[PDB]
Amino acid sequence: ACDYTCGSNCYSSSDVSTAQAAGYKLHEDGETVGSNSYPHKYNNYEGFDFSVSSPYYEWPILSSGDVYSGGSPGADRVVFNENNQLAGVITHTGASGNNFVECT
Amino acid sequence: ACDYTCGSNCYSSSDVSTAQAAGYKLHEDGETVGSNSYPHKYNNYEGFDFSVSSPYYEWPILSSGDVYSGGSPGADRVVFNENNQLAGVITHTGASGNNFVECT
Amino acid sequence: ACDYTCGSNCYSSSDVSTAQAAGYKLHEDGETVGSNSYPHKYNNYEGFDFSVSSPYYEWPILSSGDVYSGGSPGADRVVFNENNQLAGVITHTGASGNNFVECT
Amino acid sequence: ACDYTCGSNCYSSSDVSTAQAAGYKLHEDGETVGSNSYPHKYNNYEGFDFSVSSPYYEWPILSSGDVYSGGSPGADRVVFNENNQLAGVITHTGASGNNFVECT
Ligand SMILES: Nc1nc2c(ncn2[C@@H]2O[C@H](CO)[C@@H](O)[C@H]2OP(=O)(O)O)c(=O)[nH]1
Ligand SMILES: Nc1nc2c(ncn2[C@@H]2O[C@H](CO)[C@@H](O)[C@H]2OP(=O)(O)O)c(=O)[nH]1
Ligand SMILES: Nc1nc2c(ncn2[C@@H]2O[C@H](CO)[C@@H](O)[C@H]2OP(=O)(O)O)c(=O)[nH]1
Ligand SMILES: Nc1nc2c(ncn2[C@@H]2O[C@H](CO)[C@@H](O)[C@H]2OP(=O)(O)O)c(=O)[nH]1
Ligand SMILES: Nc1nc2c(ncn2[C@@H]2O[C@H](CO)[C@@H](O)[C@H]2OP(=O)(O)O)c(=O)[nH]1
Ligand SMILES: [Ca+2]
Ligand SMILES: [Ca+2]
């Protein structure tokens, strides 16, 4: 059930998969939403050890279960690549500045 | 104990966290309360060197510990961003022209 | 205090508790009053995030302080469940059509 | 994950690169910060067999991850040259007097 723990937010595999599908679709159509224009390139400044190859893109995953549509993104993100492979689930919660930590 | 001091008001991390959670929930839903429509955009006219990125929003934090729900907001504010990250705690107390100064 | 604000109407916790007790008593007795047969099932078409479980029942709360007894219902309603747990306080004021918005 | 170790402080290549960029920028502008006026010339009294040519300049790298801005410098330093090339990472930790030893 609780496959990904981002701070106090708990996400299942289905939650991640649904958010990822939505994010990948916008990327594919070349569309973006929100003040930060998601989805957009994730450069992996944090140096996470992803098993899948780049380029990576970050997209918000909402604790409410709704698909991100331009409103408040919150602290959590799903990261995917050009093959629509899941790189990882990250969050600002527990990190300083605009840095991320991986959800466990 | 006294994590943030706004004038003579002593706030703990828990106090700030509770205030931020209530304010962020309203922002995320797209709702506001009070004659000044909180939470509202904070443009950073004071130039606080926030570690997190904008857009910023200010939400009242009450000295009594009660969560703001529409009355007089007082002088104290918690500033959070769209990522649900705390930017800072500021106050009108001690600021000329009713602007803001940081809570220490 | 002004614990709930439905449009321009201001309600205290006591006002809500009194109205709730009245509606739950009729529900328990299996009786209704008013043109719309109150209390009756609240389907939650609005999809509000209630902390208590369904089924839900809506019952009018009057600004005058009188307990509803079959007259004009007004725009405000208290929503409770089978265990007499308060789900929320909602209103038609500020909403479009026959919809409801939550009182703050 | 521990590219450079100064005593007990663990530094990634990113930590060092970010520290170097900040220090070089100040040298470029002719500006210095802190009581010891950093960045300043490093004369190589320790006789490190650096791979890049002199002149060398020393600049503090903080274990907290923040960029040095004039406060307490700590024991660690990044050494870079006029071509913006990293010469090495050194520390006072484990050395007597005001001498330096290399971080490995
Ligand atoms: N923290 C972080 N930010 C990244 C990364 N890749 C791109 N960014 C963007 O770089 C800037 C500084 O963090 C922000 O615009 C941030 O976008 P988001 O703010 O949308 O994450 C990354 O790997 N880490
Ligand atoms: N002091 C201050 N007021 C702000 C800031 N951002 C928004 N406001 C004020 O908040 C109020 C509601 O939006 C407005 O009066 C707006 O001021 P201005 O009218 O000067 O823009 C800010 O950064 N500092
Ligand atoms: N000090 C103080 N400022 C207030 C109070 N209520 C509103 N304000 C601020 O005073 C400004 C002018 O009336 C308002 O735009 C609002 O700005 P903020 O929302 O930025 O606090 C209050 O009770 N105390
Ligand atoms: N808006 C709304 N009306 C509901 C809901 N559940 C029941 N109703 C009733 O559905 C019909 C259309 O709104 C009305 O009879 C309304 O009753 P009330 O008018 O008594 O609220 C609900 O979840 N939302
Ligand atoms: N240990 C050491 N100090 C140096 C060197 N180059 C300049 N200095 C400065 O020489 C003095 C004697 O150590 C100190 O003021 C020191 O500055 P820092 O303390 O800033 O390193 C060097 O190569 N080694
Ligand atoms: Ca109290
Ligand atoms: Ca030598």
Side-chain angles (χ1 to χ4, degrees), chain C residues 36 38 40-46 58 98-100:
Chain C
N36 272 90
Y38 296 111
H40 69 71
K41 278 174 161 52
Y42 176 71
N43 294 315
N44 198 14
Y45 297 135
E46 283 74 20
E58 65 166 286
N98 270 227
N99 292 332
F100 285 107

Side-chain angles (χ1 to χ4, degrees), chain B residues 44-61:
Chain B
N44 202 16
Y45 297 150
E46 282 75 20
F48 292 114
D49 302 333
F50 296 132
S51 286
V52 297
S53 41
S54 65
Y56 304 117
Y57 300 86
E58 56 161 297
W59 172 255
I61 181 171

Side-chain angles (χ1 to χ4, degrees), chain A residues 35-36 38 63 68 71-75 77 92 97-99, chain B residues 24-25 27-28 51-55 57 81-85:
Chain A
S35 80
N36 258 102
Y38 294 107
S63 60
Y68 187 62
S72 204
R77 306 287 181 270
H92 284 301
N98 195 36
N99 298 319
Chain B
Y24 186 78
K25 183 54 187 164
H27 175 60
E28 176 183 75
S51 286
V52 297
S53 41
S54 65
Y57 300 86
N81 71 5
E82 216 177 42
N83 298 332
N84 193 8
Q85 294 177 282

Side-chain angles (χ1 to χ4, degrees), chain D residues 29-40:
Chain D
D29 300 348
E31 302 168 346
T32 56
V33 293
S35 62
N36 294 80
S37 298
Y38 290 113
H40 70 77

Side-chain angles (χ1 to χ4, degrees), chain A residues 36-38 40-48 56 58 77 90 92 96-100, chain B residues 53-54 83 85:
Chain A
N36 258 102
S37 307
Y38 294 107
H40 68 70
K41 266 185 172 57
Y42 177 74
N43 302 308
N44 192 22
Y45 292 146
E46 284 76 12
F48 291 131
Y56 306 116
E58 62 165 300
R77 306 287 181 270
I90 58 179
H92 284 301
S96 57
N98 195 36
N99 298 319
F100 292 93
Chain B
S53 41
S54 65
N83 298 332
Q85 294 177 282

Side-chain angles (χ1 to χ4, degrees), chain C residues 83-100:
Chain C
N83 293 139
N84 196 19
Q85 290 174 109
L86 175 67
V89 181
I90 60 179
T91 177
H92 282 296
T93 302
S96 55
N98 270 227
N99 292 332
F100 285 107

